[PDB]
């Protein structure tokens, strides 16, 4: 019995060794791996003691440790088959401090909760994810990208300090100035080098309102050229995203329920915001008029709405409530998330949207560019080698057991896109990747593999951490 000395640890919290089903599923709703135990930590010391114990067993133990955030992983990345799942949200509380234009947040804290606290001081983080009900540790283990990344970089570019429990069970406080290799390793590190128990996030003064804008384009070339010009301009919009709309009719009528019209085939939606304060509405109106005057969208499709900063940032939670009401939230999510270099974007769009795809009815297609200069080259993040690259997110649901959608249909369409990228040398890199072999991961990492592998031996030599990533099998190094 390897799990009886685990039950002998004098934890601040406790272990669950039978009631473990909730930790054997994720948002992907496809993979289910029953863990042997679930740690509900009462402190970071509990996490460190659990990791130290597993490490003390050496190479003769199949025990693994997976930190679970909000479980938004799509293919078992936060699960541990016959291992130990650490419920990071058990430490949410509790150690949330705002000081000096920074917020110190537990790793298991949701971004929505970081924002609610921070707003009480008139402050907020600068860089977001589209959905806020995700943990600080979970999004930083990836990158955390939204409409602000073009300017502030991803969330991983807006963190100043991390408190980590390494795969050796050591508790380390790190930053660009102390234990910097661990700091940079953890950022986009896919949970490979340790568990982030606390993060210092940079803040900026928060606006009270946002002018939220949506416009349509018929031409991809003009759509993307306008996005690229907006991401390079000075005093531009505060959020820049885009959507690919395949076949769908009554798009302006769907917007009419929330947005004010001004005035009443593959289409492209450009989504923008301009941050503002009530006492400075006229300056915003003038600045927005100027910015829009340089764009080439279909004028009759201009829709806008004035909302609070919180209402805009938490917008996806409204869609979550509607899906939960229709029992459409916990369905399989066979998402495909790609990073496409600027030089390949048109060739990609021609084949993917013009040929491979017939409709976009089972989920949105995100498409927008970012600036590579905002991403630090020392992290574990994998990005294309061009100064401008695009995030392309195929955020599909599979509500059907057969036919149109249908995990088998979504999976076939995803394979076709990836096979095209490979055959036509697009230079694509996947975001939120789910490779099953170390050979597929070596190719993904490419020139950055050696760095990733050396950091792994340094911080998790026995490969105890985040086995669901499938990069390093237990004790394989």
* Minimum CB distance to ligand FAD smaller for 85 or for 413: 85
Q: 262, 288 in Cβ contact below 8 A? A: no
Q: 103, 117 in Cβ contact below 8 A? A: yes
Q: 364, 456 in Cβ contact below 8 A? A: no
Catalytic site residue 130?
Answer: yes
- The footprint of ligand FAD (CB under 6 A) covers 27, 66-73, 77-78, 88, 107, 129-131, 134-135, 137-139, 141-146, 190-191, 195-196, 432, 466, 468-469
Closest approach of Cβ 235 to ligand FAD, in Å?
Answer: 25
DSSP secondary structure string for all residues of 78-93: T--TTSEEEEGGGG-S
Separation between Cα atoms, residue 70 and residue 477, nearest integer Å: 29
Catalytic site residue 241?
Answer: yes
Closest approach of Cβ 15 to ligand FAD, in Å?
Answer: 18
Closest approach of Cβ 44 to ligand FAD, in Å?
Answer: 11
Closest approach of Cβ 93 to ligand FAD, in Å?
Answer: 14
Helix (H) or strand (E) holding 225: helix 220-232
145 labeled binding residue = yes
Closest approach of Cβ 289 to ligand FAD, in Å?
Answer: 29
Helix (H) or strand (E) holding 154: none
Length of the chain equals 477
* Minimum CB distance to ligand FAD smaller for 214 or for 284: 214
* Minimum CB distance to ligand FAD smaller for 231 or for 466: 466
Distance of CA 23 to the CA centre of its chain: 20
196 labeled binding residue = yes
Catalytic residue among 26, 163, 226, 241: 241
- Strand ranges (DSSP E) for 256-349? 260-261, 266-276, 298-308, 336-341
424 labeled binding residue = no
73 labeled binding residue = yes
469 labeled binding residue = yes
Q: 383, 389 in Cβ contact below 8 A? A: yes
Pairing of strands 97-99, 102-106: antiparallel
Coil, strand or helix at 201:
strand
Separation between Cα atoms, residue 385 and residue 404, nearest integer Å: 36
* Minimum CB distance to ligand FAD smaller for 89 or for 453: 89
Catalytic residue among 104, 130, 271, 306: 130
* Minimum CB distance to ligand FAD smaller for 77 or for 275: 77
DSSP state of 447: G
* Binding-site residues for FAD: 67, 69-73, 77, 130, 135, 142, 145, 196, 431, 469
Which residues are part of the catalytic machinery? 72, 130, 241
């Amino acid at each position: 019995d390897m799990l009886s000395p685990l039950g002998a640890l004098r934890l601040d919290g406790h272990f669950s060794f039978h009631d473990v089903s909730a930790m054997a599923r994720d948002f992907g709703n496809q993979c289910s791996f029953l863990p042997a135990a679930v740690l509900h930590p009462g402190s970071v010391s509990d996490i460190a003691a659990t990791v130290r114990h597993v490490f003390s067993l050496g190479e003769g133990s199949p025990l693994t440790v997976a930190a679970r955030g909000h479980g938004h992983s799509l293919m078992g990345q936060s699960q541990a088959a016959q291992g130990i799942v650490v419920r990071m949200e058990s430490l949410r509380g509790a150690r949330l401090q705002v000081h000096d234009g920074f917020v110190d947040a537990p790793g298991g804290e949701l971004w929505i909760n970081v924002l609610r606290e921070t707003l009480k001081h008139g402050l907020a983080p600068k860089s977001w994810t589209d959905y806020l009900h995700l943990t600080v540790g979970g999004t930083l283990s990836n990158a955390g990208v939204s409409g602000q990344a073009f300017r502030h970089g991803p969330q991983v570019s807006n963190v100043n300090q991390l408190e980590i429990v390494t795969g050796r069970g050591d508790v380390v406080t790190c930053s660009p100035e102390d234990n910097s290799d661990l700091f940079y390793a953890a950022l986009g590190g896919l949970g490979q080098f340790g568990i982030i128990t606390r993060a210092r996030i940079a803040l900026e003064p928060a606006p009270e309102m946002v002018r939220w804008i949506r416009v349509l384009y018929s031409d991809f070339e003009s759509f993307t050229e306008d996005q690229e010009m907006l991401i390079m301009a000075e005093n531009s919009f505060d959020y820049i995203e885009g959507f690919v709309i395949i076949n769908r009719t009554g798009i302006l009528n769907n917007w009419r329920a929330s947005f004010k019209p001004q005035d009443p085939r593959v289409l492209y939606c450009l989504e923008l915001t301009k941050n503002f304060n009530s006492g400075d509405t006229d300056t915003m109106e003038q600045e927005v008029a100027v910015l829009l005057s340089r764009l080439r969208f279909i004028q009759s499709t201009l829709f806008h709405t004035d909302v609070t900063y919180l209402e805009f940032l938490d917008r996806v939670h409204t869609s979550e409530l509607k899906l939960r009401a229709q029992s459409l939230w916990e369905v399989p999510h066979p998402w495909l998330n790609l990073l496409i270099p600027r030089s390949s974007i048109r060739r990609f769009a021609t084949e993917v949207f013009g040929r491979i795809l017939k409709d976009s009815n089972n989920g949105p297609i995100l498409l927008y560019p970012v600036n590579k200069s905002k991403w630090d080259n020392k992290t574990s993040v994998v990005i294309p080698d061009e100064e401008i690259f695009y995030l392309v997110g195929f955020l599909s649901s599979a509500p059907s057991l057969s036919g149109h959608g249908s995990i088998a249909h979504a999976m076939s369409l995803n394979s076709q896109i990836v096979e095209f990228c490979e055959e036509a040398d697009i230079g694509m890199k996947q975001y939120l990747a789910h490779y099953t072999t170390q050979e597929q991961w070596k190719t993904h990492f490419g020139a950055r593999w050696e760095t990733f592998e050396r950091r792994k031996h340094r911080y998790d030599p026995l490969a105890i951490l985040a086995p669901g990533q499938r990069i390093f099998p237990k004790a394989s190094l």
